[PDB]
Design a protein around this ligand. Structure first.
Ligand code: HDD
Ligand code: HDD
Ligand code: HDD
Lengths: 698, 698, 520
């Protein structure tokens, strides 16, 4: 392999333009040089427009397969064939930010899946939140413009924390349910692999008998639903803007393929109008206590892209992409969406976007669509229209797999309006808030407090405080004292206190106790205990977790016994925000050095403040106890394992200390068991519920 | 094969949009319909920008091979390997007209060849005229804008016959030589298969020893150089705007692959400054009496495109495309061209145009050029720059085929100017006019007369008449009496009368006497002589010519003997302008009917006026004689074959009449032989030289 | 004012698509609706390609004026007229990051100024660092690709802290001087209003007598040169990615218009070859102890944009934009740059980009350039070429202000190579490091330590440790103990210890003691 021009001509150098030159005097560059001009021209035109929304995203290839046929609901083979595996590509994303914005901002997350079925491409373009801000697609530009950077100065980037966003939220009551979800932990996921996915809009399924069902699609992570805490999310946005992109890529590269269970909620054609809300209203969820989610399949991502730009950046999804057996409903949000995903590709990619490798279906494509810019397809023949004398490219009958258009009855008048049930805008917002656990309510309170603090206009946060009273009077009062304004004492939308299942993240734990893919920092310094170090390192690895050694330097650290190791990073190059938990082995010399290292003390205080599991043995126990300096947090004093607020310690290490079985469960006996259990729980919420984090500086 | 969307979903119909409908009442179309929107969207975006120049063109695939190695001049394998065949695609075109303009207008013709060599793509982007209007590329917009439709009203289409064109010709004397060629028969070729091709600019060749030669490339048709006459060219422009496109496609489909000999003119590096003119001046030819053309190869076109748009419309050529062993010179016209063919593709096709099938090289392409709109190429790897730690994609040394940049010495100052010899602008214009045969001079005179007649501004044609005196005083006078103005009696640029070889088309006859691919109309009517008909039809076919039967109707025509035939076209659907010659068999009843048919009489008079061969036997002889009504044109009276001005007749057909050998040569004995000889001569110029065409109304 | 379509038809609502509907049942949306389709279509096509480099940036309007005529160096009125004020628009930016990336990352900062002079638009497209990574423009794609997110996974965003960047730095020694500047505090400015600006390449000035001078342009902040500290810069990148954009907008809105002094370094045509380095080598600075900076003007930014997208996002600069009296040199980096700023606009904006309000000159434009996509200009007349019979749009003579092309002598051969003096790649890197104050050296050490820590390939940081020995042996040892690798004990490029003036930020304090614009 040797350097060539794009037209195949080999070149002798990639370092000099053709110019006039002499040993002692340089001259002008020549216009004639085709190699140089081509290099610069290709470079000059590398960029294409970013997606108008969901510009920041990461994707991977995978496979989908149903383990239970849904033939009773649909005749689409992708959902009925339990023997075939369907290839997919999934792109996750944020919504408001442009291409270089951070992964860990507070925002809705896109969850788009392209199913390359034998019957054509089916795209399920969803989000990690089940509802949306608006009921009619016509207002998408309004809500997006309001959330995006303000027009005069293009501030702020990838943030809803500003005047215009909250101005729209207050003035468009349809969005009430949505901004409640937006302030919940759902909007700051720990990993794209640890969040749900939803079709959001109401679609339809048609079976072999022609019977139709209205449906909602669900994706549920087998690792469970987990989130970051705000201070941590903001730090990561700067310290590692690629946190989620790297998290996904790393897991797949390590063989920890993320999986999701695929479920369907179905309502028979005949029961369309049997609910208090309109089942086609995208600002409404279908309470699972009324319509259960039926899980029938599983999807896993098992292969990273070969090259990001031609694949992840150029992939195009659209709600318009449906295969036989799957259809649309009169959902007024979905209806306008179909128009958009085709239209936008014209300028973002080009009219022939379906020819791009990543977008092409895996089955035969036959039609008379022709030409267009950058056309690669060459079609032989003298005819390009139907009907024609050769009966070339005839339509497919229904029996041959032709798309079945449900003959839905339609009656009414042409008008710019929605039906009666769409007028209800507060009930589910209250239901959602009511269903949140205490810690989740606290996080939402902190979110409103931060967001409205960043609204400079007293009219904006003042009005929002009034609106919050329509969700919960107590909530309004708390926010009012935090950001200003006056919380009303009454409301025309009383909160009756009902709650529902499967809304709180507490109802989505991992399929089984695990710490798979979690990152655990092992903090050391010269003189560390090689014994505790070796035990933890092996146990972390053997439990599919990632051990990351952090030391004062990234060259060499010497253990108390003389053995050495090269840490992965030094204390200044990384931060606790980047890991799931920290472990510090003993060694008097090491503990003393770390106790005088401000950066190290911060690692401990921050990990504590961010509610992460902390484990320490030997002399490191006193290090942690003194770093935290909280009487509420007790530690081991002898050879007994001790746990307090997710802080696991063992001061006196004995021969049996690391011989106990490693059981990831409540009330484990050994040190590693209890430590891993704290990690498996993701975060220690009691630490925050008891206000301990508020006492620490991090 | 069944109808599907571009994303692979089978459809049941291509005739109805999804709408609200009932048996007796139709309703509105639905926005949700993805199949219909995709159909219309693809259609809405089918067009791409036409080429800014040479927009109207036709192309085909073929092969090239040298039969004599030019290793003494270059080490480029494409010009030294006599055992390999190099695939090529050639696109011919006009210059000024937009996409739907006519093939047979008066204009320079493009002759672009893309050589898909094993060492990369080499493009020889030439024209059918050896020189150009300007010396510096910076003025291309000026000459093109002047010739193109005038800006205020966009008139006229594909014509140099208007004020602005001739305004520029007069004011920019560098163009004198060129407009002389433009008014010659070279600008109205009979077929793209019957014209020469030239690189025009001076290129360079470098051999294995590193020695360089300045060169000119030539393409010479084996069918010879032939042209149409003006009245005919204009009629065809309307009657069949695709005349040349069809001519090329038909010949190839019929197995008559057009061929050209490839030749090179070479001047040693050391003799660069040994001529009166600058050898890098594109407004100058290298007189073949001074520098002979060395023919070393042959190219043939043998395959029509599979689909016009993705291939012929999207192919991109550029002077920048050169392979090792071939280089550029300081030709100030060529220098700027190199910049243009890359630049223009950005908007016409797209930055990734080299990825299109038709443009891709046939050898490996390896470099770090990346991304860009509509990117199909996927490159695995973590590096995309040089130098890199994996030494990925290193440059090729000269021994490995790396492009050799000649270390040409350069000395002077930075300035917007040309050197001394470039200042000569009239000598070769005179040489060209002097070298033209009498008939060619007459055709040029008629051209200037027609072109200037179409110039509304007295200042424009008035000045041009003055300029013509700088070419030939007699020419100026003749044009002045034809279009107005006052021809000067003197000139500061005397024409010394010298002539040179290989300029007149008379010096480019076919490789051997032939009528291959020529079209011959056989005009009949009920009662025609089946004998003469059968004889001519078989002889035409057996000599690789195309017999086209033309009758009063296109259903059935009955011969005098009762046999029948269905003509290819009726008299009103075709015209003599579309064929090379006409033949009319006998049959008293047929001749009588045709003698009273105005359209038929016109076929004869027009064929005569356009100088085409006319053959007739039996009763058709009197038909032709009376249709032409010229004493100067004599015809057979007995059983003897008679020829007069390309009109071949035989009044009394005998058993031996069609048993003579068919010899295409001067003074043949048989009727078919003499008739075919007249056809092989292309046109009868004596007919025009003696003013016989002027006596006929057609 | 009432809601209308783009074609002027008033609408009754912006909340509902036209559909089939009844009091109790909603129906499908109608295809016929032009108002709704137009709303969504305009929205669907709002975005245009971001700049291939310097995608993240912020700008403002201002004015420039020379207080001392430089007529001895040039006859360009913008630099000789002390009575006129020249309007300008300035866009500041980072280099590697895409549009939504953070303001406070470690990176070179772009400092582009468009001068709307009466004699045409003059753009001075500079950076906040005086030198560059490469000597020949042909390698721009290499250094940019190396620094940008790696191709397979598009990681990391707006950071030089990764394998490929440091792989290129080590392997292309021309970049040694540059990466030293990149690790200094210059790459993490506290404010765009507190950093210098440099033309970087060597330009030329021609006076009324036709005499030429080779020059370097300088912008020096009156508030002084100040920087953030790393931990702070990283936190801000997440806590307020618009920190610099807001800093600039706020200051201007509050009436604290940022100012810069404009200076010129000039070398007479005759002394072109009198230095150890080639004066046209962009990897070299002209030591101010050898060639002093002559300050002659001042520029201030005093007005924020009316709308970011049509102005700040769409503005196009190019080194090709020079007015009479200002020209180019054979600087092999500048030479290729001229080609690029015109070419890239074709896909980023469109061929008629010069018609956009923000790009249009303030003086008459007359030529025969025509058509092109989205053409707004309408030209009356039947002629569009030169020469023509009406002598329409004739050229301007030199006395009439026509651009003066210096008749520079040129002699040599056509070849892909640079001259002798370009071969020196380490001297100034050492000079720069030597000139840094103790605190600045410490910050650079911390930078190398952080950057190389983020290089996963032992070969990458291992080689860089070896390269650092060519700058300073002590530096290499310190970095080696911080990130790994083995610091060599010797070097073929000894550091002689010489220092020079005006490199350390300590030599650029505010014009006068102040806390103006500071937040407390
Ligand atoms: C009619 C306009 C409209 C409406 C009402 C919505 N969107 Fe949308 N969306 C677009 C118009 C759009 C778009 C402008 O057409 C985008 C960006 C560019 C593109 O390719 O598609 C897009 C992309 C886009 C993506 C990114 C696909 C990718 O990764 O490329 C996701 C995940 C969603 N949308 C999700 C949703 C959800 C869950 C919605 C609420 C039910 C929603 N969108 C309503
Ligand atoms: C610098 C500008 C310039 C100059 C001085 C010329 N041309 Fe050119 N030509 C172009 C700029 C151009 C172009 C604008 O770049 C075109 C049209 C679009 C395209 O692809 O290439 C083109 C196309 C084009 C084609 C058509 C290739 C095809 O079939 O696509 C031919 C045959 C020529 N040119 C021939 C010539 C000859 C024989 C010239 C005189 C020696 C000449 N051109 C001078
Ligand atoms: C030949 C390629 C090339 C080279 C060698 C450089 N650049 Fe460049 N630069 C471009 C090719 C480019 C570009 C690709 O054409 C850009 C981005 C898109 C655009 O409009 O211009 C650009 C933009 C760009 C901008 C942003 C203008 C804005 O705000 O829009 C600045 C400040 C610079 N460059 C500064 C420099 C400096 C100080 C350089 C070293 C002396 C340099 N560039 C070398």
């Amino acid at each position: 392999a040797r350097l060539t021009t794009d037209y195949g001509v080999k070149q002798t150098t990639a370092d000099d333009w053709l110019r006039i030159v002499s040993d002692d005097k340089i001259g002008p560059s020549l216009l004639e040089d085709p190699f140089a001009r081509e290099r610069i021209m290709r470079f000059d035109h590398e960029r294409i427009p970013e997606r108008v929304v969901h510009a920041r995203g990461s994707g991977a290839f995978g496979k989908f397969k149903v383990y239970e046929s849904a033939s009773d609901l649909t005749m689409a083979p992708v959902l009925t064939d339990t023997s075939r595996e369907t290839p997919v590509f999934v792109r996750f994303s944020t919504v408001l930010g442009s291409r270089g914005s951070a992964d860990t901002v507070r925002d809705v997350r896109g969850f788009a899946v392209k199913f390359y079925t034998e019957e054509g491409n089916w795209d399920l373009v969803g989000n990690n939140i089940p509802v949306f801000f608006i009921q009619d697609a016509i207002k998408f530009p309004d809500v997006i413009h309001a959330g995006k950077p303000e027009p005069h100065n293009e501030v702020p980037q990838a943030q809803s924390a500003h005047n215009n966003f909250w101005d729209f939220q207050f003035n468009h009551t349809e969005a009430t349910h949505m901004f409640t979800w937006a302030m919940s932990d759902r909007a700051i996921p720990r990993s794209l692999r640890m969040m749900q996915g939803f079709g959001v809009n109401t679609y339809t399924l048609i079976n072999a008998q022609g019977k139709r069902h209205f449906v909602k699609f669900h994706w549920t992570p087998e690792l469970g639903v987990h989130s970051l805490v705000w201070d941590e999310a903001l730090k990561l946005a700067g310290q590692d803007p690629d946190f989620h992109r790297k998290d996904l890529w790393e897991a797949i590269e390590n063989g920890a393929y993320p999986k999701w269970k695929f479920g369907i909620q179905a309502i028979a054609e005949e029961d369309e109008h049997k609910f208090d809300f309109d089942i086609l209203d995208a600002t409404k969820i279908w309470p699972e206590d009324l319509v259960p989610v039926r899980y029938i399949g599983e999807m896993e991502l098992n292969r990273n892209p070969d090259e990001f730009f031609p694949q992840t950046e150029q992939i195009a999804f659209c709600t318009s992409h449906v295969v036989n057996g799957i259809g649309f409903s009169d959902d007024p949000l979905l209806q306008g969406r179909n128009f958009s995903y085709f239209d936008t590709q014209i300028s973002r990619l080009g009219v022939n976007f379906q020819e791009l490798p990543i977008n092409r279906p895996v089955c035969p494509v036959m039609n008379f669509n022709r030409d267009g810019a950058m056309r690669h397809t060459i079609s032989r023949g003298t005819v390009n229209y139907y009907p024609n004398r050769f009966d070339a490219c005839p339509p497919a009958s229904l029996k041959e797999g032709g798309y079945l258009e449900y003959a839905q009855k339609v009656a009414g008048i042409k008008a710019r309006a929605r039906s009666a049930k769409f007028k209800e805008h507060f009930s589910q917002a209250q239901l959602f808030y009511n269903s949140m656990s205490p810690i989740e309510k606290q996080h939402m309170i902190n979110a409103f407090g931060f967001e409205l603090d960043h609204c400079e206009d007293p009219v904006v946060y003042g009005r929002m405080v009034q609106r919050l009273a329509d969700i919960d009077l107590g909530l309004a009062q708390t926010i009012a004292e935090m950001v200003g304004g006056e919380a009303p004492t009454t409301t025309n939308h009383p909160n009756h206190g009902r709650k529902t299942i499967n809304l709180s993240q507490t109802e989505f734990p991992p399929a089984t106790p695990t710490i798979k893919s979690r990152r655990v920092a092992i903090i050391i310094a010269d003189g560390y205990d090689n014994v505790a170090y070796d035990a933890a390192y092996a146990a972390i690895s053997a439990n599919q977790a990632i051990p990351l050694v952090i030391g004062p330097r990234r060259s060499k650290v010497t253990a108390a016994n003389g053995s050495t190791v090269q840490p992965h990073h030094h204390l200044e190059g990384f931060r606790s925000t980047m890991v799931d938990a920290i472990f510090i082995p003993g060694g008097a010399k090491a503990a003393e050095t770390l106790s005088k290292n401000g950066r190290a003390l911060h690692w401990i205080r921050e990990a504590f403040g961010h509610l992460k599991a902390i484990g320490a043995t030997g002399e490191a126990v006193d290090l942690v106890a003194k770093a935290i300096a909280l009487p509420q947090v007790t530690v081991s004093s002898e050879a007994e394992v001790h746990e307090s607020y997710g802080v696991v310690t063992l001061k006196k290490v004995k021969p049996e200390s690391f011989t106990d079985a490693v059981k990831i469960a409540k009330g484990a006996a050994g040190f590693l068991g209890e430590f891993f259990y704290a990690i498996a729980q993701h975060r220690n919420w009691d630490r925050e519920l008891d206000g301990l984090h508020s006492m620490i500086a991090y």
